[PDB]
Amino acid sequence: REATWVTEKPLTLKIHMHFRDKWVWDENWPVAREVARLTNVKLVGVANRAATNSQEQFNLMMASGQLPDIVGGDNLKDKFIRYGMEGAFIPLNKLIDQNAPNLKAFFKTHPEVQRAITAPDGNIYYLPYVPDGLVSRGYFIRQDWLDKLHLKTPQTVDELYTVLKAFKEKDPNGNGKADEIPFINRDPEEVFRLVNFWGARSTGSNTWMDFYVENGKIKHPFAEVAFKDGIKHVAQWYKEGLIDPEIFTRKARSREQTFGNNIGGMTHDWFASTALFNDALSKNIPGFKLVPMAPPINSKGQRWEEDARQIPRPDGWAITATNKNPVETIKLFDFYFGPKGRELSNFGVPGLTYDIKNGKPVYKDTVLKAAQPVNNQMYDIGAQIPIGFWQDYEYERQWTNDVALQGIDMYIKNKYVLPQFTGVNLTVEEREIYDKYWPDVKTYMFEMGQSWVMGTKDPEKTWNDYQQQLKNRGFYQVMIVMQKAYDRQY
Numbered sequence: 001r002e003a004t005w006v007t008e009k010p011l012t013l014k015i016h017m018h019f020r021d022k023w024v025w026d027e028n029w030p031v032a033r034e035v036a037r038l039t040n041v042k043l044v045g046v047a048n049r050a051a052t053n054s055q056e057q058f059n060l061m062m063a064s065g066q067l068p069d070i071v072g073g074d075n076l077k078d079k080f081i082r083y084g085m086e087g088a089f090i091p092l093n094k095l096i097d098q099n100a101p102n103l104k105a106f107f108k109t110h111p112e113v114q115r116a117i118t119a120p121d122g123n124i125y126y127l128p129y130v131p132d133g134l135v136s137r138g139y140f141i142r143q144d145w146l147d148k149l150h151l152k153t154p155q156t157v158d159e160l161y162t163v164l165k166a167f168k169e170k171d172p173n174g175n176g177k178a179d180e181i182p183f184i185n186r187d188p189e190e191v192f193r194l195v196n197f198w199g200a201r202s203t204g205s206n207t208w209m210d211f212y213v214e215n216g217k218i219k220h221p222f223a224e225v226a227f228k229d230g231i232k233h234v235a236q237w238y239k240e241g242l243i244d245p246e247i248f249t250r251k252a253r254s255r256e257q258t259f260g261n262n263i264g265g266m267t268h269d270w271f272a273s274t275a276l277f278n279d280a281l282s283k284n285i286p287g288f289k290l291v292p293m294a295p296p297i298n299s300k301g302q303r304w305e306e307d308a309r310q311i312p313r314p315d316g317w318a319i320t321a322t323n324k325n326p327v328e329t330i331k332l333f334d335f336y337f338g339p340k341g342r343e344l345s346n347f348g349v350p351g352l353t354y355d356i357k358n359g360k361p362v363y364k365d366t367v368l369k370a371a372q373p374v375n376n377q378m379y380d381i382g383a384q385i386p387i388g389f390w391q392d393y394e395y396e397r398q399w400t401n402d403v404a405l406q407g408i409d410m411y412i413k414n415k416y417v418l419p420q421f422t423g424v425n426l427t428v429e430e431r432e433i434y435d436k437y438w439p440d441v442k443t444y445m446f447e448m449g450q451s452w453v454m455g456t457k458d459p460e461k462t463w464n465d466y467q468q469q470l471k472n473r474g475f476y477q478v479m480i481v482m483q484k485a486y487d488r489q490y
């Protein structure tokens, strides 16, 4: 028996958690095993290991006529709210109030987090992934390639074009082959963010393809004429091979591949893990220096960093109506928001990945000096996963090197980060329109975006058809309710 036990009799529950198109909940995870030891509740995964579409797996689960006890994963906020109000997920308000002291204390000190996760009916249907930190992504460029080609740090988009063209054509890796790929990215959606260079938005927040506000008006980036004009330039850069031809396909290991083989010249990605490649490749590629770069002055005369950490993220977990032990489940959920539970969900397992030194969790040298970024190492053992948990920036600080730290400091000091969209408060009937049309519109917008970038569709020629399709698919009905909710709030 332990003092942290939430049940005397051992309990096993079924969890469907497919996340980030790559992972599922693993009961064999060191973190999962330690939480199970401490709480006396074991979670067994029921999601499909083979699948590469997390959203599709949720949809199949909901249509399968049989629900597990817990459902977790990334980008499930809208689905948690929709199916919560339908009765598939249970409200947590009373359960938290009666059984979850840690969450109660958290929500009163973080009222904006409670607001962001609350449904239009007043119910909380899930607990969120709560990130910790301020900045997220920044631009990184190969300083050693700039120096080798005797080029200055590009200050404008036009200067950047010249630099990326030189990366492609002037053989900076010195192997006599045109193998260089100037701009690479882990995230296909970052190719859309390049429209920032031409004064167009791609998203209002860390959530992909999110709305934004300009002059008291709700706008969606993909519906704006600025995007039409901006994506033409992105398409041109793709055409000329300045953007990774595989930007839509390469994905997760883009940096390991392109930086590791000394072909990648630039990216836009998280400071800590991106700067880590300087250390990992220090001997394999002598002189490898990937440095933070201020965003280039765009066509609107400004230096935009569009991305920032989003607190909370639209990720987390919920309790189903089929769960026979909702009290034990909410108590397990609450363990994660206490000191020990928070430490495990961030750092891993004590004596394995970290040690308590002077009362502080300190990562082992084997973790810090490893080839893999620490967050990747955490995923492998069940930490830093998009369950209901509270991230602790102290975990991140420990593997944020001086190059990363100084880049973060530059971005904070110079205020590059654009004001982020914090959402609007929809009513139940407004949310019905939102849930009916928006997911399918977003999928269509992505498809059109990819087509424009790859040149299979001409953005100028197809814009009228695209706008007609947006209307036919209900996008403008969504826009009406979004503005209606904004005007009511502000």
Ligand SMILES: O=C(O)[C@H]1O[C@@H](O[C@H]2[C@H](O)[C@H](O)[C@H](O[C@H]3[C@H](O)[C@H](O)[C@H](O)O[C@@H]3C(=O)O)O[C@@H]2C(=O)O)[C@@H](O)[C@@H](O)[C@@H]1O
Pocket (backbone or CB within 6 Å): 020, 021, 074, 075, 252, 270, 271, 272, 273, 274, 373, 375, 384, 396
């Ligand atoms: O320095 C870091 O790498 C930084 O990463 C943060 O994690 C990110 C991660 O880098 C990546 O961007 C990931 O992207 C997800 C996305 O959030 C969404 O779920 C999508 O459906 O799948 C993507 C994917 O992984 O393929 O998002 C992570 C996140 O937590 O937002 C943190 O680990 C941070 O502490 C770290 O320093």
Ligand SMILES: [Ca+2]
Pocket (backbone or CB within 6 Å): 171, 172, 173, 174, 175, 176, 177, 178, 179, 180
């Ligand atoms: Ca070369």
